[PDB]
Design a binder for this molecule. Structure first.
Ligand code: NA
Ligand code: NA
Lengths: 226, 226
């Protein structure tokens, strides 16, 4: 069975989707990885758009929302975008999902992944920065959550809120933390000193490169802790 | 009765909240204006946070979500932040709203504003870039919508989607358009040539200042057209 990681944040602008791309890409080097763009903003899909255009994929018809609606089969949406890196793209129609009236709505992605799953070692799911039914679908499939967060007003309260949300879903779902946009010269490192003592704190990403090496480090620590 | 303007976009990163602040601030110069932050990300509230801290307001207890939940009275949340500019702040707890089970949920803001309204000439409501029940609450109170949008993949499709959403609410709600981050040197001005022929197209904002003057222009055209 694949290990399923949701990349989440209920704050926008914390490099959620960047983290998802990079961690997934790193995992793809020695594992088979599916990346699922479940973000209405579709940043991961935009990042790979060039490659998707070259293959002439109709992601208007073949996308995560059309899977959730059971209008297409999951396998027909899967796009190879890098070596050992497959992608299910998002499209703006995902915006309707929260309003669609559907039975057993929370379990639609869990159902769909079950028909597939076994081809993959990891599934990394990128979600909207909202507590909504799209997120619940991700969380109910997942084994782990990684939250990239930034030193900001209300960061710990936001984290508490997200945690509350997970419990009220009735999940026992471990959440691992990264501080992104990390400012080594910051005067009051108030988030770092709160988070650093937590067992699931992975590390910081500074505000071929030294960027990727910081992610490799985070990833190494995560894979060690799980 | 106040004229109620929802500032919306289902794409993030188009200066939705910046537009809301600036248009509202301009309207406040010769009118009494209430700004409502109904965005889970709370950018307008962050913008005014300094002023809110100086007044020692507990926006943990007194905020738009607590109004929607009927735990506090609207008037007890209102914060004066500039001359003729009042503010109802947002807080991260707004994230739970989409999941709260509540009767006549779509009309909660409309109900709350009715107990107040009459003190104001304009109410400007900033919303999340999501099609959800928070947005519906805004739209059902509104007389007009202004959408600041950017030259991007899927812009016209996103606009179509938003329009579909408004009709399915059963509203006859005019939508006015701005292109923000406008690049006068752009090679293919494909959005501008589509939008420029529409009667509700207000104009462009370029990527005391010349910035405010472009907004004044947009605002003048809007007030002329309505
Ligand atoms: Na939605
Ligand atoms: Na929500």
């Amino acid at each position: 069975k694949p290990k399923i990681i949701t990349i989440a944040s209920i704050k926008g602008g914390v490099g959620k989707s960047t983290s998802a791309i990079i961690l997934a890409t790193l995992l793809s080097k020695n594992n088979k990885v599916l990346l699922i763009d479940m973000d209405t903003q579709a940043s991961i899909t935009s990042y790979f758009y060039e490659k998707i255009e070259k293959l002439g994929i109709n992601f208007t018809k073949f996308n995560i929302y059309e899977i959730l609606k059971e209008n297409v089969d999951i396998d027909s949406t899967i796009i190879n975008v890098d070596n050992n890196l497959d992608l299910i793209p998002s499209y703006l129609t995902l915006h309707n999902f929260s309003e669609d009236k559907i039975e057993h709505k929370d379990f639609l992605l869990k159902t769909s992944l079950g028909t597939l799953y076994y081809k993959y070692d990891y599934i990394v799911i990128d979600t909207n920065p909202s507590l909504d039914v799209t997120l619940k679908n991700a969380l109910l499939c997942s084994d782990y959550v990684i939250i990239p967060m930034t030193a900001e007003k209300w960061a710990v309260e936001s984290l508490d809120l997200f945690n509350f949300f997970v419990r009220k879903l009735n999940l026992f779902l471990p959440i691992f933390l990264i501080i992104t946009r990390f400012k080594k010269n910051r005067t009051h490192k108030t988030l770092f000193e709160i988070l650093k003592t937590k067992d699931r704190f992975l590390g910081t990403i500074s505000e071929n490169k030294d960027y990727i090496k910081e992610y490799e480090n985070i990833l190494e620590i995560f894979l060690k802790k799980i």
